[PDB]
Amino acid sequence: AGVSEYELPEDPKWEFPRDKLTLGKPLGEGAFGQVVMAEAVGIDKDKPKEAVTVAVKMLKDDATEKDLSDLVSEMEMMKMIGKHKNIINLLGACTQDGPLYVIVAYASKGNLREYLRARRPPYDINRVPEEQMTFKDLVSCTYQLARGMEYLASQKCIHRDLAARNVLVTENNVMKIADFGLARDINNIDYYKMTTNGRLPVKWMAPEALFDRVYTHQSDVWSFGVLMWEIFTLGGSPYPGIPVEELFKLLKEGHRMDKPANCTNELYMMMRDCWHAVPSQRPTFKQLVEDLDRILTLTTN
Question: Which CATH superfamily groups domain 107-297?
Fold first, then answer.
């Protein structure tokens, strides 16, 4: 839909009244949208006079048409995806007679990369030493995210932008996949066809997307492997020292990232399996969940 003449249809089951929403302090500014904390009175049907803290995604003053298209697409993707423990929860939207607000559950511990970096083993005033990550914590993080993606893939949707920056962490340390603005519905098609030059960060893109312009669930599996590497480096950035302009040829030559310091060979081989050159030889998200559960069960004892 061309947003400059598209009028958002009514969808009463998701609509939230503007007079019940009080916008608060900013939580983030990316480039296509901005997210603010807010108080939503009555958005929990079970506590109808109660104000609950939420996060609201909206356009910036300098928004483009594509920014608005992405915000609509993110809202519609979250509607169709449905509910899961490891997917950030869509609560409602203000869509009629004013700016588009997409209202989502608030994750008080912020994005995953900064959450991990603040909990690294020993000047940063943002560190949280009382919550330093153990190996079991890292495996648990990975397992939760694999469960979220297993659910996502069972809904026949591809995220396409999986990365630590697009994961949120709640007060109870629950991992929440977020930022569905690039996600797509691939029900009834065999693969999603990429344009010539996409809007997906190159360092998380599977080679078949990069070079053959195709995206499947197994392309998300590749990105999940990079996400795993981010987790087990406690928020490191991938292919360190390699600019994206040099990475294309390195990937064609079979280059893969080295093993992170805090990782077992078992977990590194799981990353490497996610980075198999042949998409159908990478594990599925169902298989990753099974393997991570077994590792996590052994670790917790």
Answer: Transferase(Phosphotransferase) domain 1 (1.10.510.10)
